[PDB]
């Protein structure tokens, strides 16, 4: 009946179904790109639904997309975390590199120590996946000389 106005997709997101015009009772779902989620209040979600009401207005405004946070990476005992440049970002696609405390520990390759923040909000490594690396003790290297 009444036509609802053109909708603008959220940055890093989309609106479906894409119609030329929208009419009473029409439903649309707002979605975000992979690595992002829809943000209402302080709550993240996969889709938000708005509808074209009888009076020609939408039930809600189009919300924003928020980049997924992987939060604090797992603590590596006897280890250290170096973040990729300054901000110490822990959000989608950014990286950390694990190291072991030299000189009394060395890391197992296995792995590169590079853990990258996934679209599912988990810190992952090519080889170990979620699991963290292992710092092993360095042996037989005394620090005091013998005459």
């Amino acid at each position: 009946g009444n036509e609802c106005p053109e909708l603008q997709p959220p940055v890093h997101g989309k609106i479906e179904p894409s119609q030329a015009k929208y009419f009473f009772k029409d439903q649309v779902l707002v979605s975000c790109d992979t690595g992002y989620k829809v943000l209402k209040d302080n709550v993240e979600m996969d889709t938000f639904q708005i509808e074209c009401l009888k009076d020609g207005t939408w039930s809600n405004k189009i919300p924003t997309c928020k980049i997924v946070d992987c939060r604090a990476p797992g603590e590596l005992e006897h280890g250290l975390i170096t973040f990729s440049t300054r901000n110490n970002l822990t959000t989608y696609k950014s990286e950390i590199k694990y190291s072991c405390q030299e000189p009394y520990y060395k890391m197992l390759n296995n792995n590169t120590g590079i853990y990258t923040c996934s679209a599912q909000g988990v810190w992952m490594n090519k080889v170990l996946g979620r699991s963290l690396p292992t710092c092993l003790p360095v042996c037989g290297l005394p620090k005091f000389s013998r005459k």
Binding site: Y104, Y105, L136, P137, V138, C139, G140, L141, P142, K143, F144, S145, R146, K147
Partner: protein
């Protein structure tokens, strides 16, 4: 240690003292990996009654009845550096024989792992076997000649003796030297381990790695410091697999 010289502080950071809760030392050992101490199997059980010469669990020393001290230098005095650690479990070699001292090796799992540092770090497991006449270093807090106890950890440097001439030397004496044992000391005698040095480390230097490797643990020797007679140590390369299976240590 007989005919030894005082060990220079800090240059034996892998050595462990096995002591009663009281503090009285009785054996030595070595830190392996993060939380294991390798020592002599005969350090971890009561003396057996000759009229019933078989080892049982009832004779084993309880984890609550002894402790480990790492980063120690003085025999009875104290550091800074010392870390006093409780025992979780103990495991003597499955084929240990208390009568012939073969497979005289044991692994003490710590209740609490030490903080690794300049004074406390592990000794490496041996990569391969020992060449005849290699110079090794035996260290310990046991008795010396005229039977005093030292103020300080003592050490000797002695050559490894070929397995064959070690067997021929101990016959006389109706005493067998098996594959799992390695021999050190010189024919003239003098430099040797003794009572209280049991389980202490025998180590050598690797080059050009600059890494120190555990070759053996102190096991037995007839009389301390007497000619035509060599000190017998548990050959760790021989039981490297068992140590790795129980411990999960890797260099």
């Amino acid at each position: 240690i007989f005919n030894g010289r005082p060990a220079q502080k800090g240059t034996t950071p892998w050595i462990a003292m096995l002591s009663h809760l009281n503090g009285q030392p009785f054996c030595g050992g070595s830190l392996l990996g993060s939380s294991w101490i390798v020592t002599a199997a005969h350090c971890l059980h009561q003396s057996l009654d000759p009229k019933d010469p078989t080892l049982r669990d009832s004779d084993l020393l309880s984890p609550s009845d002894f402790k480990i001290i790492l980063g120690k230098h003085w025999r009875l005095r104290s550091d800074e550096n010392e870390q006093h650690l409780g025992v979780k479990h103990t495991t003597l070699h499955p084929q240990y024989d208390p009568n012939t001292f073969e497979n005289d090796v044991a692994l003490v799992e710590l209740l609490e792992s030490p903080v690794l540092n300049a004074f406390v770090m592990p000794i490496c497991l041996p990569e391969g076997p020992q060449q005849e006449g290699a110079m090794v270093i035996v260290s310990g807090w046991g008795k010396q000649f005229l039977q005093r106890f030292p103020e300080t950890l003592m050490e000797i440097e002695i050559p490894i003796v070929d397995h064959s001439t070690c067997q021929k030397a101990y016959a006389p004496l109706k005493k067998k030297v098996t594959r799992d044992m390695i021999c050190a000391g010189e024919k003239e005698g003098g430099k040797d381990a003794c009572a209280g040095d049991s389980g202490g480390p025998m180590v050598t230097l690797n080059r050009e790695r600059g890494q120190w490797y555990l070759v053996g643990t102190v096991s037995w020797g007839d009389d301390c410091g007497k000619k035509d007679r060599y000190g017998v140590y548990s050959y760790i390369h021989h039981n490297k697999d068992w140590i790795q299976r129980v411990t999960g240590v890797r260099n």
